[PDB]
Amino acid sequence: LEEKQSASAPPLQELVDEVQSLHVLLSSPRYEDTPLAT
Amino acid sequence: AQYKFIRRWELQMRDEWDQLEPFKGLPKPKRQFGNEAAEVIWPYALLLERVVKVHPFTKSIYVYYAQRQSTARGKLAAEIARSFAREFLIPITFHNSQVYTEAEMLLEYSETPWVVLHSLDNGQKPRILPVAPVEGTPAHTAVEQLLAEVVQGCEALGASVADPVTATRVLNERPLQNQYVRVDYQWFGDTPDERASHLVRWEFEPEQIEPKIRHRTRHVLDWLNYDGNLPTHRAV
Amino acid sequence: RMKEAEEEARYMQFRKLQDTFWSNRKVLVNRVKSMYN
Amino acid sequence: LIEDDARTPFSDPSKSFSPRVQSYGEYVRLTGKLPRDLPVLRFVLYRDSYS
Amino acid sequence: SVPSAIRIDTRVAYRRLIKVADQVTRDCPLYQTEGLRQYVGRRFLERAERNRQQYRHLLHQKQRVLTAQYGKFIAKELQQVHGLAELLLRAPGNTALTSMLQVLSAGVGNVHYQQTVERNYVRYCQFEEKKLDRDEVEEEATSDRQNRIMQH
Amino acid sequence: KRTEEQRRRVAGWRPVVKLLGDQRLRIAIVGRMNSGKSSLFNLLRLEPTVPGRSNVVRDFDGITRDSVEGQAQLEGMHFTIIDTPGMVQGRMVEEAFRTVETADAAIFVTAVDEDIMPEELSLMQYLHLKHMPVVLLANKMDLIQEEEEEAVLDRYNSLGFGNAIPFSARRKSGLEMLAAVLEPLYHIHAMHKVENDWDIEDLAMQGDESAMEEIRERNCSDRFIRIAIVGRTNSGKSSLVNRLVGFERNRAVDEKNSTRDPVELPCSYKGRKLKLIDTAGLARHRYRADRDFIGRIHGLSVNEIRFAHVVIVVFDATEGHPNKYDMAV
Amino acid sequence: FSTFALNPETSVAPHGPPRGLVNRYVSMGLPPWAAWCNKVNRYSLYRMSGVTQRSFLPKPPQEMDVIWLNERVRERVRTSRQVQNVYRQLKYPYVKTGIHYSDVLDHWVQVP
Amino acid sequence: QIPSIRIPVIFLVNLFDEAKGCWFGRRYETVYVERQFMREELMPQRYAIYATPEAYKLLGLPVVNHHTHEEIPKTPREYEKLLERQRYDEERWKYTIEYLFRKYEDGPPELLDRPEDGWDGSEEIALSSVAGXXXXXXXXXX
Amino acid sequence: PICPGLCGELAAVPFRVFLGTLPTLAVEERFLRQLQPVFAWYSSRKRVKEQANEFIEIDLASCDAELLLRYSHIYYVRRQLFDELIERQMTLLDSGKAPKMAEPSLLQCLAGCNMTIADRLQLEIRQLGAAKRAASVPGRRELDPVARLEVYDYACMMRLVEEDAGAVGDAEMKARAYLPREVIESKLGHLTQLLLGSDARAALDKKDVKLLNRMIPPDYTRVGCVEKLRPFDVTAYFRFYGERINNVKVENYFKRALWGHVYRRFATTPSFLSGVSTYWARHSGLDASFTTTTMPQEVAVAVCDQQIQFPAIKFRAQYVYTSPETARQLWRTDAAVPLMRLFPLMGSRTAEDLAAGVLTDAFWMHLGLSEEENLLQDSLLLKVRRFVDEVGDMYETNIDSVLKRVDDNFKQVVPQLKA
Numbered sequence A: 001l002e003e004k005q006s007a008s009a010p011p012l013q014e015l016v017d018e019v020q021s022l023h024v025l026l027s028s029p030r031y032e033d034t035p036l037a038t
Numbered sequence B: 001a002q003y004k005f006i007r008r009w010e011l012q013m014r015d016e017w018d019q020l021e022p023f024k025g026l027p028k029p030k031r032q033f034g035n036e037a038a039e040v041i042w043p044y045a046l047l048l049e050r051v052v053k054v055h056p057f058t059k060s061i062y063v064y065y066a067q068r069q070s071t072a073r074g075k076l077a078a079e080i081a082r083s084f085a086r087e088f089l090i091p092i093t094f095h096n097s098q099v100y101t102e103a104e105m106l107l108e109y110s111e112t113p114w115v116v117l118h119s120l121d122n123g124q125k126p127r128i129l130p131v132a133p134v135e136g137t138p139a140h141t142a143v144e145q146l147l148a149e150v151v152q153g154c155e156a157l158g159a160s161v162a163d164p165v166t167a168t169r170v171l172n173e174r175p176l177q178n179q180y181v182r183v184d185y186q187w188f189g190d191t192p193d194e195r196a197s198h199l200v201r202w203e204f205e206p207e208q209i210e211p212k213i214r215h216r217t218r219h220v221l222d223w224l225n226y227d228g229n230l231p232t233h234r235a236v
Numbered sequence C: 001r002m003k004e005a006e007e008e009a010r011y012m013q014f015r016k017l018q019d020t021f022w023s024n025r026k027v028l029v030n031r032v033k034s035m036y037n
Numbered sequence D: 001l002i003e004d005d006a007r008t009p010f011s012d013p014s015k016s017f018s019p020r021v022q023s024y025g026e027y028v029r030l031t032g033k034l035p036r037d038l039p040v041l042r043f044v045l046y047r048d049s050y051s
Numbered sequence E: 001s002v003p004s005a006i007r008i009d010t011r012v013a014y015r016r017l018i019k020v021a022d023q024v025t026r027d028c029p030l031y032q033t034e035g036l037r038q039y040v041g042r043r044f045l046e047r048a049e050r051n052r053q054q055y056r057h058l059l060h061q062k063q064r065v066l067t068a069q070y071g072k073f074i075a076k077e078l079q080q081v082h083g084l085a086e087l088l089l090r091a092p093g094n095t096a097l098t099s100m101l102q103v104l105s106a107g108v109g110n111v112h113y114q115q116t117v118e119r120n121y122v123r124y125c126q127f128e129e130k131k132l133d134r135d136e137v138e139e140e141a142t143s144d145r146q147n148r149i150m151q152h
Numbered sequence F: 001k002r003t004e005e006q007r008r009r010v011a012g013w014r015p016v017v018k019l020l021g022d023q024r025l026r027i028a029i030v031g032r033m034n035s036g037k038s039s040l041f042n043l044l045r046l047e048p049t050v051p052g053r054s055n056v057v058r059d060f061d062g063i064t065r066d067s068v069e070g071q072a073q074l075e076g077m078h079f080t081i082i083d084t085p086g087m088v089q090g091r092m093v094e095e096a097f098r099t100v101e102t103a104d105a106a107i108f109v110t111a112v113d114e115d116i117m118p119e120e121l122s123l124m125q126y127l128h129l130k131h132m133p134v135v136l137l138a139n140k141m142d143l144i145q146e147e148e149e150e151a152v153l154d155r156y157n158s159l160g161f162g163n164a165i166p167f168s169a170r171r172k173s174g175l176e177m178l179a180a181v182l183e184p185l186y187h188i189h190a191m192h193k194v195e196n197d198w199d200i201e202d203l204a205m206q207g208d209e210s211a212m213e214e215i216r217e218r219n220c221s222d223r224f225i226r227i228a229i230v231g232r233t234n235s236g237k238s239s240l241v242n243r244l245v246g247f248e249r250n251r252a253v254d255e256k257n258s259t260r261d262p263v264e265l266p267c268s269y270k271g272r273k274l275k276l277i278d279t280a281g282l283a284r285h286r287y288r289a290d291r292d293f294i295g296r297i298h299g300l301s302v303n304e305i306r307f308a309h310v311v312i313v314v315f316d317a318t319e320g321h322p323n324k325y326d327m328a329v
Numbered sequence G: 001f002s003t004f005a006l007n008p009e010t011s012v013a014p015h016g017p018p019r020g021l022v023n024r025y026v027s028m029g030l031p032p033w034a035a036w037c038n039k040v041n042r043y044s045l046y047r048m049s050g051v052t053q054r055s056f057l058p059k060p061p062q063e064m065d066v067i068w069l070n071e072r073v074r075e076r077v078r079t080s081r082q083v084q085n086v087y088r089q090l091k092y093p094y095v096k097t098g099i100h101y102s103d104v105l106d107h108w109v110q111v112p
Numbered sequence H: 001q002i003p004s005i006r007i008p009v010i011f012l013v014n015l016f017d018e019a020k021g022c023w024f025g026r027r028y029e030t031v032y033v034e035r036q037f038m039r040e041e042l043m044p045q046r047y048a049i050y051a052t053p054e055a056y057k058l059l060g061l062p063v064v065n066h067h068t069h070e071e072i073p074k075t076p077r078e079y080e081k082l083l084e085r086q087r088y089d090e091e092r093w094k095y096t097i098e099y100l101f102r103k104y105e106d107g108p109p110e111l112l113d114r115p116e117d118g119w120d121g122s123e124e125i126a127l128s129s130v131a132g133x134x135x136x137x138x139x140x141x142x
Numbered sequence I: 001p002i003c004p005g006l007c008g009e010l011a012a013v014p015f016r017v018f019l020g021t022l023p024t025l026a027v028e029e030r031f032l033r034q035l036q037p038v039f040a041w042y043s044s045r046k047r048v049k050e051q052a053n054e055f056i057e058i059d060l061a062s063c064d065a066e067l068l069l070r071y072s073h074i075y076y077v078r079r080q081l082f083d084e085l086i087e088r089q090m091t092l093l094d095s096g097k098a099p100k101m102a103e104p105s106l107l108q109c110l111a112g113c114n115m116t117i118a119d120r121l122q123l124e125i126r127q128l129g130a131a132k133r134a135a136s137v138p139g140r141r142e143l144d145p146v147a148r149l150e151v152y153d154y155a156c157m158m159r160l161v162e163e164d165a166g167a168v169g170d171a172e173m174k175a176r177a178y179l180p181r182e183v184i185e186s187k188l189g190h191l192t193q194l195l196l197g198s199d200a201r202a203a204l205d206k207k208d209v210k211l212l213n214r215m216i217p218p219d220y221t222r223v224g225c226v227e228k229l230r231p232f233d234v235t236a237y238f239r240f241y242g243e244r245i246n247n248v249k250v251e252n253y254f255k256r257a258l259w260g261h262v263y264r265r266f267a268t269t270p271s272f273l274s275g276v277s278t279y280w281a282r283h284s285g286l287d288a289s290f291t292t293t294t295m296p297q298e299v300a301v302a303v304c305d306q307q308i309q310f311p312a313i314k315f316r317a318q319y320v321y322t323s324p325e326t327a328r329q330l331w332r333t334d335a336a337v338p339l340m341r342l343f344p345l346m347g348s349r350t351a352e353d354l355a356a357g358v359l360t361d362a363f364w365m366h367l368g369l370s371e372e373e374n375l376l377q378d379s380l381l382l383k384v385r386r387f388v389d390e391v392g393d394m395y396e397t398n399i400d401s402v403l404k405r406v407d408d409n410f411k412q413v414v415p416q417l418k419a
Ligand SMILES: *P(=O)(O)OCC(C)(C)[C@@H](O)C(=O)NCCC(=O)NCCSC(=O)CCCCCCCCC
Pocket: E001, E002, E006, E007, E008, E010, E011, E036, E039, E040, E043, E044, E047, E048, E049, E051, E052, E074, E077, E078, E081, E084, E104, E118, I091
């Protein structure tokens, strides 16, 4: 592995990314155990 | 022809035993074209005369030299690299027990042989050093200067490490690498205890030295030929 | 000393479980203060 | 592990031992998940001479 | 290097063999999804390469009369293939044949292990076919003897 | 040490007694020295007739000096398994060469604590020449870690033998998996017996004399006469049983205590089924008290006397008057 | 997991003879395992240190006839099986009458 | 368990063994002979004298100390060690780097090309053999 | 080595070539002694270990087959390779049953070209026959120096005669030492920039990079080693890079082949190779004290003459693949090198390749630019541009107008026998 590796060697996008990530964290059933303050 | 097959197997096994009678448990070295310095039986006297140590943070040392050269200086440098690979490579790994050393003869034209040094850090780039022997310096001092250069390179590579704590930890948890060295223990001893029998060894372990035999007191008394403050029996 | 840090990691989960339970009780008792007042 | 016999000394490699428990283990309460839409819990309480 | 008719016939034979192999895998439980399909493919391709090499060596009116013998040899090989297919189709009923197919699909041991199981499969099927006849005629003989004894 | 003068005499041995031969599946446990061959044989053997008899096992190089055969039972499969001495000095003994050639199959057992020395490569290629069915069984599987199983098992698959079987003789794991591999051979050998049983019956109806005498051997249903040969060490009793069978079946060397596991051999003498059972050399208590392992081997010697039908005690006649301990026997 | 196997994570109390005793023995000259003797005191340690030899000659040095070079009769002790008993036996060297040939005088000469 | 040691001895005359048909030792030659042999047969007939530096000096040969009986072997292993040490002291040139690599001084023998005089065309060998995931798609609005 | 860079997209076709029965690896010893300039590729190739036999897994579709056949020097293994090649080609053609055919009027000129080539055939086969009887020399040693010359050893004999014409020892390796791939790609990008301002691609396609990794012999994969290319590999790479970087449409493959052959001539030119080549350690930054970054002129001239020699055998080997009906005949009767890299480029493609090659070679001989100096001059580049665009347009407009040029240019490039 060593030998082979040495031989080989406010934007709208981010805003909508935050929107999608927050919606996922809110509506996901895996995160249903999130504390109420969070 | 079954008896002939059995005879062939016996002959092959007899040759194998003649080759590795004291060399059964160690692994076999790489069967390359430049690593001929490993399959040969090394004299322990020569290995003791050639004792050289490198920085503890290095893990791999390879040398690459061409088989056929075009220039006179290229032939000289290739001869220097070959002499170094045949003289100082095996002592380095045998006396460091941490580094893996390898030599290679490339079937091409390369007037400048080189040596690569890999440290214990996986993210750190290896150090490459070309063999440029001075024309005025003979082969002996040229090989000596090459050895000094590679030792200084290993020292720099080990001093430029990122995290010495993790370097030392991976050094501790790295297995052995000098298992392939075939050495002939000649008139010096078979086991390190008999080898260093002329020196007091204070580095021991209590649970290791504790014998586990039945009636160990009786056996130790018999071995020491010591009375043990025990009254003699009848003896009359 | 590193094995000692591994012992805390086993019980550190439960100490976090106790804090969040009261944090839920503090935020819920705040909601009923707005509903009834 | 405690010694199993007294006649044989600790020097014998064939010494037999027996395991005896010091603590049966550690236990913690079980706390189920609390729903958000139903935080209010209703229960019945039976008390005998408790204020 | 092989005539088109022979190529078509051997493709039909290999298709039938693969159909029978998958049918066996689905009917009796083969614990691997690949099963004996890969082993059958390897063996058939090896025999195909061997026969093609033999045909290349034989190509050297003598060639015309040898082509007929080679075609008849290939026809016999394909009839043996059909027999193998029928035996595999009847295999799921018997328990030993299923175990043999399972060990051939798993591929444990050396080649001589798999070869002895491969070659002896047809012989074991024929042995089971003859066992019923032998035991039936023996039971009929014993029944006739017992009847003629009861008459005496 | 084999010499042309010695090997010429062995060829002139005439069988005093006829070996019965194997009528069931034969499997030889082939492997290296101290690889768990005897321990694997203990889990597989099942002899309710001689319960005290077992295969000796110890974490030492060269515990099994001589081969031993016995009946084994595994998931309703009746067959016999042969224990073979490990490759000593990187070579097999002559008693083990002729023994593994009689077996139908073989189980190549290898341990993972030590790498594959060039001796197994010689033995594996030796079994390749005989065209014998061999299965690779990786013993001592419990020593390997979970994250290391994929590395070692990829190597055992590259030795020509496909899909090596993981097995642990101590934890008895993989026993139900080794049984499934032997299932086809059991039905195969059962197929060979009945077909050969049909051939020997047609010749009997023809009038062949060699076929009628063979049927009478199978038609003979009598209780076995277990005849054991016991005696003091260095007395020649193992060398005697080799003269009975007609070849060097057991090992017989000048050094004392060359047999460490009793060996049983089914034979037929004048139409009487009998079993010649080798035994280890008995010894006094003042010689076996300090020597613990010899006391265990002597324990297996006295046990075979309790189940032997006819005991034949041998003693060195060159001494003249027999030994005092030989009378106590 | 087996409860009868000692837990490798824990560590039992050290029981064997300590660094002090082992270092004292190895500095006296005996091997480190030699600390496994029986009932040693100051005088027994002085005796087992070997500073003086427990040997002698069959005759006084002025009355010696057989040639002995660096040879002294020794005493080997062997403790019995059970306990507390020992057998002490003397051990004599291998006297072999050498019959050599002298270069100064012709005829050979023999001497024990 | 002391093995049979062989001692060095300086011969004074060309001794020819009649039985085996060879020379025991040339004149002024240092031979490793049996102890009993030298003591009972060679010494009395004055055919050889013990090899010592003073004997070499008296005979005029170049002095050399073989260190006889310096390490009295109590075991064949120690005897082998002593013989190896004596062999080294005799030929230190046997244990140099150039002699250790005399076989590989020209390179790999497999790499070296050797001329062939002849061969039988029927010895050629011609054998043929049989030669037989998923991820996620992440989109970013831009 | 009939055509450097004549590569086509095709599936991998594996084959297990025998190596020897252990422990007597006789053929392996022969390979170690003979395959020295290609031992890097030999070690890079995968090894297959049977129960008691050893096999090398070689891909016939790749350049590995031709590379082994050129340096084989072992008659039985090379004849078995030849037979396997021709048999699998016959089977693939029989299974395809639909090869692309060229225009019949174009194949007539190429058919008439084979008439004048038989004389040069008779001369070059005599050159190949004397090299076969030179096995006793320690340089090149064959197994049978008295056996009759056959069809399969044409590559070995041609390489031996090229070495004898170069008269310098190990010219191929001496050139690979000074020819590294990175600087070659950089200067080839510079050349395609100088030739086409905007009509050149920004880079090479990834599929074509995979194809080139398939068709180029692999070097050592060590940390300090640098990828180095033999002069033949450099010529092939130049031709393929040109013919794949030119932005001519796929329907006008003639212009792409013309660009490829122009690049091939640029590569085979000695002065261009000397100007482009640099030392590998100089490129990597290891050694800079030699100051010898220039390629040896004698070795350059020798390795260029190596590719210059033997045009007739290459022309006939390509005419074999020009038509499949004549391929089945000439594969086992006349001279033919059955390379799998030429089969996917069927009749039309290979005929356009032959036409572009002869036109480019004749234009090269007419200019004589390989004589004076400095192929990188603006006047010469503009002449090349005008030539290639004129030839492409003339081929697209009228077939006979360029067929007459092809005929005269063939007569010019391959001269008739003189005494
Ligand atoms: P394509 O059409 O180009 O391929 C055609 C092939 C088949 C390659 C022919 O060129 C060819 O090789 N033809 C002659 C060979 C032939 O017909 N072979 C038929 C094989 S019969 C046979 O014996 C194979 C049976 C193997 C069965 C294995 C059973 C295993 C069960 C456990």
